[PDB]
């Protein structure tokens, strides 16, 4: 799985 910030534009 991958961890991308919840506020990143392309979450």
């Amino acid at each position, epitope marked *: *799985r*991958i*961890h*991308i*910030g*919840p*506020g*990143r*534009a*392309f979450y």
Partner: antibody
Framework: DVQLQQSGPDLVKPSQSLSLTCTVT?????????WHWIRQFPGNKLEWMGY???????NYNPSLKSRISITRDTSKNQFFLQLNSVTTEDTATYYC???????????????????WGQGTTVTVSS | DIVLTQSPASLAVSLGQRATISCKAS??????????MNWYQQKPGQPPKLLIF???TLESGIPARFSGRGSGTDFTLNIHPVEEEDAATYYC?????????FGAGTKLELKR
């Protein structure tokens, strides 16, 4: 390994447009998660400017949104920064950077800007 | 915007000593199993180099003298023992949301 290199004019006059190029070697731009432009001001303050995502969609810093544009060229493997109506306040060192998936925890991945260019100094003055 | 505050702004240390640099976020940077706080090191005339990501993970090639810890809003970078080559400016950076922001930086200088 991957290498990024910024190029563009080192001197721009006020109210004109600044255009920089980031050439990527050893890695194609279509493979990276996102490609960023960050600038560093004298005094060392780093301000993130924006990025072009793999989908080709872009996101910009709200402070620069009205005058910034980021595009990419899949063939020449380059991405670009266009900043309009520059003022002397835009004098800074400009860097491009890659955001890539790093190994994290137990077979997981975490995105981080891991490779930055050498940087290019731009002075805005009349 | 998430504002990152580093402390102190400058730190003078002797070789072999322990250095601790703090980074405080204006709002939590934790989410679904990860703390989105990374650290960069920058030597004069060089671009920032990624040191630690996700709060405590060392990037490949970085020596174990560097350790990161923290969660929520409070993070710390520790260097022990401090070496000559460690004199540099260190920045914390949050990836919890856009815009991505950096702290102002802590300059690690050598004591004499």
């Amino acid at each position: 390994d991957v290498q990024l290199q910024q190029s563009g004019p080192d001197l721009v006059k006020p109210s004109q447009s600044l255009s920089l190029t980031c050439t990527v070697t050893g890695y194609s731009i279509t493979s990276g998660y996102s490609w960023h432009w960050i600038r560093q001001f004298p005094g060392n303050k780093l301000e993130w400017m924006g990025y072009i995502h793999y989908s080709a969609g872009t996101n910009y810093n709200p402070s620069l949104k009205s005058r910034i544009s980021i595009t990419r060229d899949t063939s020449k493997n380059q991405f670009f920064l266009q900043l309009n109506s520059v003022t002397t306040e835009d004098t800074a060192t400009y860097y491009c950077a890659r955001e890539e998936a790093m190994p994290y925890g137990n077979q997981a991945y975490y995105y981080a800007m891991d490779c930055w260019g050498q940087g290019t100094t731009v002075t805005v003055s009349s | 915007d998430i504002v990152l505050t580093q402390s102190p702004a400058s730190l003078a240390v002797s070789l072999g000593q322990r250095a601790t640099i703090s980074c405080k976020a204006s709002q939590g940077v934790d989410f679904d199993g990860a703390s989105f706080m990374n650290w960069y090191q920058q030597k004069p005339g060089q671009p920032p180099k990624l040191l630690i990501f996700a709060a405590s993970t060392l990037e490949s090639g970085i020596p174990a003298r560097f350790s990161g810890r923290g969660s929520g809003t409070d993070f710390t970078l520790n260097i022990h023992p401090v070496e000559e080559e460690d004199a540099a400016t260190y920045y914390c950076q949050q990836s919890h949301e856009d815009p991505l922001t950096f702290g102002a930086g802590t300059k690690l200088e050598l004591k004499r």
